[PDB]
Amino acid sequence: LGDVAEVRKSFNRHLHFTLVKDRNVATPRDYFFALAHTVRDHLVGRWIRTQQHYYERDPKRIYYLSLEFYMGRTLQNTMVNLGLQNACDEAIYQLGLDLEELEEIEEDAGLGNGGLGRLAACFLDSMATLGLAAYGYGIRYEFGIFNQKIVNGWQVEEADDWLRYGNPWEKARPEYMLPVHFYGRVEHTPDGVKWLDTQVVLAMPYDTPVPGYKNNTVNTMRLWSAKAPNDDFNVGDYIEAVLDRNLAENISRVLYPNDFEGKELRLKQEYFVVAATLQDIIRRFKSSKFGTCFETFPDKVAIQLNDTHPALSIPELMRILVDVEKVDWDKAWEITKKTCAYTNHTVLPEALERWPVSMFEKLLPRHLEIIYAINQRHLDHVAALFPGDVDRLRRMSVIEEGDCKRINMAHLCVIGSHAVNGVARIHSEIVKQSVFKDFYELEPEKFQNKTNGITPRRWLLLCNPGLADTIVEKIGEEFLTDLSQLKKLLPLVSDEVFIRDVAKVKQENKLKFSAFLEKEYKVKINPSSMFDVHVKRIHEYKRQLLNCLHVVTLYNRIKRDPAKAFVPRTVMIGGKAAPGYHMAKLIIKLVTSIGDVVNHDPVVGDRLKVIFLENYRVSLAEKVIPAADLSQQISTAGTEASGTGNMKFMLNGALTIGTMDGANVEMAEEAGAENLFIFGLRVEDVEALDRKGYNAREYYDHLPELKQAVDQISSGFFSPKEPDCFKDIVNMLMHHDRFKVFADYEAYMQCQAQVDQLYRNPKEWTKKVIRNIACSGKFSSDRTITEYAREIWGVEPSDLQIPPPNI
Amino acid sequence: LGDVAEVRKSFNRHLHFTLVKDRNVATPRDYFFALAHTVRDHLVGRWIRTQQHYYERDPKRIYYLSLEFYMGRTLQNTMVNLGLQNACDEAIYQLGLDLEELEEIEEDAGLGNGGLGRLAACFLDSMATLGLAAYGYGIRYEFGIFNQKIVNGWQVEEADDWLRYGNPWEKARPEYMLPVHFYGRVEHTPDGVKWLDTQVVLAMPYDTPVPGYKNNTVNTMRLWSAKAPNDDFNVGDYIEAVLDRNLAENISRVLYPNDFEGKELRLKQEYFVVAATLQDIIRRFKSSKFGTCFETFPDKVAIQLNDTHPALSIPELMRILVDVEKVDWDKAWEITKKTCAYTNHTVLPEALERWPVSMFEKLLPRHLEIIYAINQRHLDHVAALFPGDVDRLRRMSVIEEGDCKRINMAHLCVIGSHAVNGVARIHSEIVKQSVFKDFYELEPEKFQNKTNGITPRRWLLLCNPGLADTIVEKIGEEFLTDLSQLKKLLPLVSDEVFIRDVAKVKQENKLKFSAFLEKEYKVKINPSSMFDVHVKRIHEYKRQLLNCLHVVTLYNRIKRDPAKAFVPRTVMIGGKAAPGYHMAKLIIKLVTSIGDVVNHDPVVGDRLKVIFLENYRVSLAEKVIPAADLSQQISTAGTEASGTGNMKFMLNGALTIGTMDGANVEMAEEAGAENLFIFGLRVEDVEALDRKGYNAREYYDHLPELKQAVDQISSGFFSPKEPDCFKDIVNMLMHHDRFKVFADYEAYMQCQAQVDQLYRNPKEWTKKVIRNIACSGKFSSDRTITEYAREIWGVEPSDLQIPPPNI
Ligand SMILES: *Cc1c(COP(=O)(O)O)cnc(C)c1O
Ligand SMILES: *Cc1c(COP(=O)(O)O)cnc(C)c1O
């Protein structure tokens, strides 16, 4: 190949001219950078051409606004979307280096946190693959959230210094910087409303390429860094300036800060992305090749609000249009509603974001005025349609009364958007009928569903090339951009060759992940054991404790009859606890405490191993998901909207043990519920238990295997040196357990036995797996994005065709 | 040429892949950057090879430590030292751009201030041209000193945001960062002295290439940026951290800060460069290919102290050697004295740098201990050689008594260095016999002279290619690296062709600078008028006022007899005033006030124009010096050590009006005093006037042209709206004038008449010019550096021969 020679020549060129190093002084990190630059150069040609193409053809632009972008690592994705993986592997080998070693030096982008952020990243990959003129907008968080470390079995938060050595992917655009205004006061003058005496924070843009899979599109993620404007002063004025500089820069410091007016910092962050972004969208709109003029704005601009975090987009668009662009209020409002769309990710109305009005009086006095005007006009309309309905007016109002007046940002999003969607079929029904019941009665057509999805490139082609090839051999390459083509795998459940091939891939993946496990955690991993994986946020509603009780029950069962034939398990539990969440940190400690007992018991041996997977991130998900046999998706029914981890396990050859909630429902409906290990209380059963009243004591008293497990946890069997360590866990499970852990224990145990009986038969296990994989095509973010594009954005995929670039 | 095609291809490549731009979105600044990168790539090959060569051949390394590096602009110097000027000019033309326009977009590096900084930059260029293994070490000042603006005839200081858009020349080395310690306390333990509880500031290195002229050497300038280490805290601890972060970062904010414990900030800056640098020098020494071991240190390392600013090098080298490297005190001291050398730039002992010991007690307690030990051992030696001489001990001590104990940093430099030099022959005699009289008596051999110099590349080949070619045609190219070869021009004073050629070059230069003048200042410049140039620091001792009085006298002379034939003059006065220097700001105002009257008087017309050259910098020196007919070097005799501006005018075809002091003396001695316009009080005459007592009133009273000029200044003729504006100027000239402005007025007037009579005869003017240029070869920094290398560093130039690189 001439390709292998080009990468080799480009790597050395970057090493000498970009890094200003030679092979004697270079570190592995320098080698990662040299390669990352080599690979980025292949994107640049397409990136320039793509932006030249959108300027020429002026397509409708999609703006995806999120406070989270859980991007992971970029080197591998970039290499695969450009087809250069094989050429780089060989070039790096010939250079005396190891591609996978270099891949491990890259930092996980500290730009996301959980589901909401990964959803944004999958979306961006799909929008680029579908040829949409899409731009991701967010904050360039300098220190991510935090890297989880486990010290003495407890979680410790370490700072995520991911930009320490620089990010090779991003380009700084200091020339496209915009001012963000805070505080000040508002004056009504004859020339229009003026927002005066404001503090100014500068928004500095950094652009990152978002490549399309096997097309020529390379889109942009534009992330803003907070910087103070520089400069008279007395001693006090000098200290005021240094502090304002620091408070400016900590807007883009960490995701979801705590600090207790660190809530004011969250509001500042929200406005900082909104104002930065909207000024950029408008500037792009009026700077079009060949440009009263704002009437075409809803035809050239869609703004998607990923949760209520970017909710200020509504009154800020109203502000720029009316106070700067001199557009008439009514016209600006009809423009606002048509440009904005809102996606909700939560169930029950109390999770929805609220801000005190007093906080708005101080930080954003002009936006408060606009919000008040939007609300009044909205309630006049409601009063016209439903005369004398006084309680309807209070329910539908964006401003709520209580111990202080508050602004319901969700209500503001509903009123200022043309479309409102939930993230799964039943969640979207709850969004309609319960969360925004009154809004649904007034405008049913506004409310929609956009079932979540995952990208088939990262969550298959990247993390599981072995499985990807085995599917490619049988049904060709077209499924990678049209994942519903995996249904052609259905007849292959009879094929003895395919079954032994899918099983071989899984075991290869299991062996590669065992090697990571033994090296890092120092536990002897059984290769023939079943990989039982539960990876998500440590939270009571997610019920890692339910999984803990199962593990203790199994430990006790091996101890009672050590001669008995037992299905071997490697139980992996991972996830980050919120720093101030006392119960979740107790739970992490329980898992490691259980593991200490289980993994060091000589009677137990190679039958049961328990590991807490430290620092669950995007990059680690890509190692563990392809190696999983069983996926635990065991949240209490009625708590989960969707879930995307569910989808990742289904595509990578794992069977699912779960409740009938969130994504599991649509996964059952796609593959048939018999191919999934559904158990426990149904949404309606949970409600019926609340009518009876949950008495967890009755369960503990009349379930012997559970009583033994809880007593061990309580008495200090898993914590000999500090026997009251889990007192608050036990106290919660018996008296305050809102998530009904005991109520689902029996059903969960019985269900795990059915899992054990199926794993005992390798062929029928893998047959059920093939049925899962073949019916997962629906859960492609391509499908989700095509849905958003046609039913919300009014754009057609592949209507823009970027041609091969010029160097 | 294949060269023109390569630059074109590299520019576009940098524009696309480095800048991530196309020609539609690119600004002229992007074009400057694209070109700057193209050109830097040619240095990199040599830069890598040079550092590979010094590692292989382990030569003795020269470390030039300065708090100032007045580098100017780099694009032109870089192009000429690589021979790519012509190829770039053509490539940029073919691209549709203008090289000189792009050259003007580059910022003057805000790394220097005056003479001391430019000396450092000329030295670095010479050391590279001579093939020395030389490293410049200093501070990367983020905001320079200040850009001078003239608003309403007064100086305003504007912030020098020179790094705003980035520096294309430098490479960040965050991996070679070193800690700097401050404060803390000191503990004597059995394992040696320990410096504990210190605050730590990080020194982040940035490397800049220093190319040799027509050789393959590219050396390094290593400049340190102050950064705080990142991270528990209460409300107060948080504010303490934010302030310490800011105080850390303002170490590398501005040159010579004011802030009144902004003196503590100067001390911090001094230590920050010393500690950063010495740790780097040692790390390089022990990391040599194949490395008790410190005995070879004085043979592999020379540290040159450019003034007392890096004086802490002595006790810090002692600290690292004894407390870290476990070297014996006596051995470490003999190593210290042999590695360090000190250059003094001042006359009279009261200008020498002192710090209160209390400030050292707090900021550097371990260095104070070391200084006290160095001093005691030094005074024991003095006590041995001169027993019972109690006053000799007090004079020779590094610690002085008074309103508080103080550390004389100059005494510390003398005691801890093997060599001590002045910067001109007579200044070096004063350094020996007066400033350090007692030290000279004890060790005469330590004391030396190293007459200053300027680089022939920047101060001839770059700023004056026209003159450079006219010399190249007659004596070939060898003078550019052996400037004493300009003596071959001496017989050409008879050559009628050469004389008219040198005059043609001057007039071309005058015309190009008139075009800059008319465009920027909006005054009609007479092309046949004499360019009278006085560019330096605005200070009473430099006597811009003496030049002001001459200009007023000439204005008055044209007004008395407007019909009379008068030699036309363009008088240019430039220079920056220290922000707190009331008299110097008054002086700038006087010049602009005079100009307002002179330049707008219709009786005067094209005979006399007065301009204040705004923001005298390196880049502006390169425009004005080649266009000058007359160089004013008029400081009071006995005040100037050397001067390098003097030298620049002499090389570029200007005649010198000056006093018999500093560089003027050696310039007279080189070209013969008859070829220079020497006037006024001699050093000995100044002393004799102090014996008589200077009564400036006697001069004002009995010199009518002066009385008229002073009365106009006093009465408000030059300031109609604020007639008492120059009251403090007049009050000073009559009662407190230490610089004897009136005493030299008559001699200066008479001398200017001789200048007027010579300019009246073009041929004899240019003959005298040729005599100046031909005898300027001595004032090459190559000569100075060869001198330092052989008489101080013990290195031979051209003993290291870097071979052509590999790409
Ligand atoms: C896909 C993914 C998630 C989402 O998991 P859910 O519990 O389904 O919300 C979270 N974190 C990471 C690292 C992921 O890759
Ligand atoms: C050469 C130079 C100097 C030194 O001038 P002196 O008065 O001779 O010390 C100062 N500033 C600039 C910009 C120079 O180029």
Short mmCIF file of N, CA and C and ligand atoms in Angstrom, two decimals, chain B residues 70 113-116 118 454 459 535-537 542 616-619 621-622 625 633 640 642-646 648, ligand 2:
data_model
loop_
_atom_site.label_atom_id
_atom_site.label_comp_id
_atom_site.label_asym_id
_atom_site.label_seq_id
_atom_site.Cartn_x
_atom_site.Cartn_y
_atom_site.Cartn_z
N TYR B 70 15.34 42.16 23.67
CA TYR B 70 14.69 43.11 22.77
C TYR B 70 14.91 42.57 21.36
N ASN B 113 13.24 46.06 26.61
CA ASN B 113 12.87 47.43 26.92
C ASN B 113 13.81 48.48 26.28
N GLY B 114 15.11 48.35 26.51
CA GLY B 114 16.10 49.27 25.99
C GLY B 114 17.40 48.60 25.62
N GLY B 115 18.50 49.33 25.87
CA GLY B 115 19.86 48.94 25.49
C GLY B 115 20.33 47.57 25.92
N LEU B 116 20.06 47.24 27.19
CA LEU B 116 20.42 45.97 27.82
C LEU B 116 19.76 44.77 27.12
N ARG B 118 18.45 44.83 23.88
CA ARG B 118 18.88 44.76 22.48
C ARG B 118 20.29 44.18 22.38
N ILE B 454 26.91 45.71 17.86
CA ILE B 454 25.61 45.50 17.25
C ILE B 454 25.73 44.44 16.14
N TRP B 459 21.19 45.24 11.84
CA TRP B 459 21.51 46.64 11.76
C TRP B 459 22.24 47.07 10.49
N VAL B 535 16.87 59.45 19.05
CA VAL B 535 16.03 58.36 19.52
C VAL B 535 16.68 57.57 20.65
N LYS B 536 16.08 57.69 21.82
CA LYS B 536 16.45 56.99 23.04
C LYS B 536 15.45 57.31 24.16
N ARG B 537 15.60 56.62 25.29
CA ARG B 537 14.87 56.86 26.53
C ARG B 537 14.75 58.35 26.81
N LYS B 542 19.91 62.39 29.13
CA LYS B 542 20.04 62.16 27.69
C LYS B 542 19.90 63.46 26.92
N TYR B 616 8.91 54.35 19.91
CA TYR B 616 10.22 53.90 19.49
C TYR B 616 10.46 52.48 20.07
N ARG B 617 10.64 51.53 19.14
CA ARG B 617 10.79 50.08 19.34
C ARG B 617 11.94 49.63 18.41
N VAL B 618 12.26 48.34 18.44
CA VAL B 618 13.23 47.74 17.53
C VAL B 618 12.81 47.95 16.07
N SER B 619 11.59 47.57 15.73
CA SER B 619 11.11 47.63 14.32
C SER B 619 11.13 49.03 13.71
N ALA B 621 13.21 51.51 14.85
CA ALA B 621 14.65 51.80 14.76
C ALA B 621 15.17 51.39 13.37
N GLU B 622 14.72 50.24 12.90
CA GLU B 622 15.10 49.70 11.59
C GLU B 622 14.56 50.50 10.39
N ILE B 625 16.71 54.57 11.38
CA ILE B 625 18.18 54.63 11.41
C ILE B 625 18.76 54.70 9.98
N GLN B 633 23.65 62.22 19.91
CA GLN B 633 24.18 61.42 20.98
C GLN B 633 24.77 62.41 21.97
N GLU B 640 27.18 58.28 30.33
CA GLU B 640 26.99 57.13 29.46
C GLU B 640 28.16 56.14 29.54
N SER B 642 28.33 53.10 27.49
CA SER B 642 28.55 52.74 26.10
C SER B 642 27.49 53.37 25.21
N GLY B 643 26.40 52.65 24.96
CA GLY B 643 25.43 53.06 23.93
C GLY B 643 25.62 52.17 22.73
N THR B 644 24.54 51.78 22.10
CA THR B 644 24.64 50.95 20.91
C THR B 644 23.90 51.60 19.73
N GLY B 645 23.04 52.57 20.03
CA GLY B 645 22.33 53.32 19.01
C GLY B 645 23.31 54.12 18.17
N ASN B 646 24.25 54.75 18.86
CA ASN B 646 25.47 55.42 18.31
C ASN B 646 26.03 54.62 17.11
N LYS B 648 24.67 52.07 15.51
CA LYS B 648 23.71 51.80 14.44
C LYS B 648 23.68 52.91 13.42
C1 LIG C 2 19.95 49.89 19.65
C2 LIG C 2 18.69 50.27 20.37
C3 LIG C 2 18.70 50.95 21.73
C4 LIG C 2 19.96 51.33 22.48
O1 LIG C 2 20.10 52.79 22.41
P1 LIG C 2 21.10 53.59 23.40
O2 LIG C 2 20.56 54.92 23.79
O3 LIG C 2 22.35 53.61 22.55
O4 LIG C 2 21.22 52.75 24.67
C5 LIG C 2 17.49 51.28 22.35
N1 LIG C 2 16.30 50.98 21.76
C6 LIG C 2 16.20 50.40 20.56
C7 LIG C 2 14.85 50.14 19.98
C8 LIG C 2 17.40 50.01 19.77
O5 LIG C 2 17.30 49.39 18.57
#
